Design a protein around this ligand. Structure first.
Ligand code: HEM
Ligand SMILES: OC(Cn1cncn1)(Cn1cncn1)c1ccc(F)cc1F
Length: 453
């Protein structure tokens, strides 16, 4: 098995002391191929990059979701929420059963109007810019996606478009998640001058939980019936057990959903607009579809479903830069992967999604091209070749929510404005635990098409 450069007792860990660790891992995969061993003090992971190996790893009879180091660290504030619980921890399956109905078609139809509310705020913001002002793309997409999950899920308005900097929840969330990403902290977390970081961390967690408090208080004070995600959290009963979620778990789900529910979707919208401005003929075709399909002053649910090419633009953005770029599995028993690589019970695998999605045996030699037409025919994409939403029963519960919101918003953007890559922007991918273009800016010239209420 290939392995990258080690550094004595630190093994491979210094390779990840960099601003862009996933990009570093992709380069290592480029050098070493479909599988490599990665060791840190205390742990071994095998990174997989080929569809033939990832297909086997996605067999749930042999491999289950693993909580990676990052997932274990963030559990300090995500707790035993859906993202951070083991498949055999009781509260995984219990919450899964209670919340799944909140992501049906019916539920999506119910969220649509509130998705439109936030989308209209974005379009209005851009209509109101003065000559020669520009748009900060990831910043505005984060405003939109946070507000969208807040309002759709919790009936809570973050009012991000009324602030010129991030909502304080975001500012604490980013520092709390960055603290966790500082996983290699002198491999001496109990050092001298981390009392500072540890204090700050608790303060950041407290800011997030005080917002959770307001969400729950506002719900309780409400005179109206919301019938949303929070409703199901508070009231829903697991049909396998008869039980509703306990209070502590509810708080962890709210934090889980507010975070997971916006950050990767902001990244996706930003990457999609990047690839559109860099591929003008693709932009033209998407914009022609938006104009033909979005014939009313605001979009209906059924219209968003008809933006097929827009859907393909999003899927092709997720192919090249899947914004949650890795998920971890473990071997349920001793087994052999790909007829060649023996694994012991409990061994960890990490699926490196961007490399999977560059597997030339699947996608051909145009892997780096942005070509949404690749997705014209679903059945021409082998099982387990495209996995931006994870796998099996632990796959993203929010997938259709993300894609409906992103399709609606990108469609409205393409209907209402012409975009200019005025700086000839050079892609710079900032990594947190997710991926996003940094410093991406455009200019938008309004086509002066009225919006509705
Ligand atoms: C483009 C957007 C998104 C992408 C790329 C994404 C990706 C993923 C991935 C890869 C996983 C599996 C994680 C793992 O195996 O450790 C996952 C799980 C999850 N996602 Fe997403 N997601 C997106 C949007 C959303 C949205 C909008 C929500 C919520 C409204 C959401 C909530 C979750 C939850 C709760 C889980 C845990 C599911 C479980 O194991 O029970 N995600 N997502
Ligand atoms: O998988 C996510 C990605 N993420 C990281 N920061 C924000 N989101 C959560 N998710 C699932 N669908 C959407 N997001 C995750 C991965 C690792 C981790 F520690 C936390 C964490 F939330």
């Amino acid at each position: 098995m290939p392995q990258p450069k080690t550094f004595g007792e630190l093994k491979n860990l210094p390779l990840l002391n960099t601003d862009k660790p996933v990009q570093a891992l992709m380069k290592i995969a480029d050098e070493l191929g479909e599988i490599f061993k990665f060791e840190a003090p205390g742990r071994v992971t095998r990174y997989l990059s080929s569809q033939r190996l990832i297909k086997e790893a996605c067999d749930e009879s042999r491999f289950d979701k693993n909580l990676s180091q990052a997932l274990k660290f963030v559990r300090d504030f995500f707790g035993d929420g859906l993202v951070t619980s083991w498949t055999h921890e009781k509260n995984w399956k219990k919450a899964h059963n209670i919340l799944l109905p909140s992501f049906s078609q019916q539920a999506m139809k119910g969220y649509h109007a509130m998705m439109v509310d936030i989308a209209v705020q974005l379009v209005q913001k851009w209509e109101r810019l003065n000559a020669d002002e520009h748009i900060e793309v990831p910043e505005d997409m984060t405003r939109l996606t946070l507000d969208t999950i807040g309002l759709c899920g919790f009936n809570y308005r973050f009012n991000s478009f009324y602030r010129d900097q991030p909502h304080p929840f975001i500012t604490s969330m980013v520092r709390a998640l960055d603290e966790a990403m500082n996983k290699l902290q002198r491999a001496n977390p109990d050092d001298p001058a981390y009392d500072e970081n540890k204090r700050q961390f608790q303060e950041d967690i407290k800011v997030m939980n005080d917002l959770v408090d307001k969400i729950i208080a506002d719900r309780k004070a409400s005179g109206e019936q919301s019938d949303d995600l929070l409703t199901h959290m508070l009231n829903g009963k697991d049909p396998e057990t008869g039980e509703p979620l306990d209070d502590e778990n509810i708080r962890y789900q709210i934090i889980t959903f507010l975070i997971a529910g916006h950050e990767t979707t902001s990244g996706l919208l930003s990457f999609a607009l990047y690839f559109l401005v860099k591929n003008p003929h693709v932009l033209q075709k998407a914009a022609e579809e938006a104009a033909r399909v979005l014939v009313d002053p605001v979009p209906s649910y059924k219209q968003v479903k008809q933006l097929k090419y827009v859907g393909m633009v999003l899927n092709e953005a997720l192919r090249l830069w899947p914004t949650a770029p890795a998920f971890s599995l473990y071997a349920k028993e001793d087994t052999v992967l790909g007829g060649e690589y023996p694994l012991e019970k409990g061994d960890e695998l990490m699926v490196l999604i961007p490399q999977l999605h560059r597997d030339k045996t699947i996608w051909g030699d145009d892997v780096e091209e942005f070509r949404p037409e690749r997705f014209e025919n679903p059945s021409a994409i082998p099982q387990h070749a495209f996995k931006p939403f994870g796998n099996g029963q632990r796959a993203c519960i929010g997938q259709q929510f993300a894609l409906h919101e992103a399709t609606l918003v990108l469609g409205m953007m393409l209907k209402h404005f012409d975009f200019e890559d005025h700086t000839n922007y050079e892609l710079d991918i900032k990594e947190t635990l997710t991926l996003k273009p940094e410093g991406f800016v455009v200019k938008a010239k309004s086509k002066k098409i009225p919006l509705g209420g």
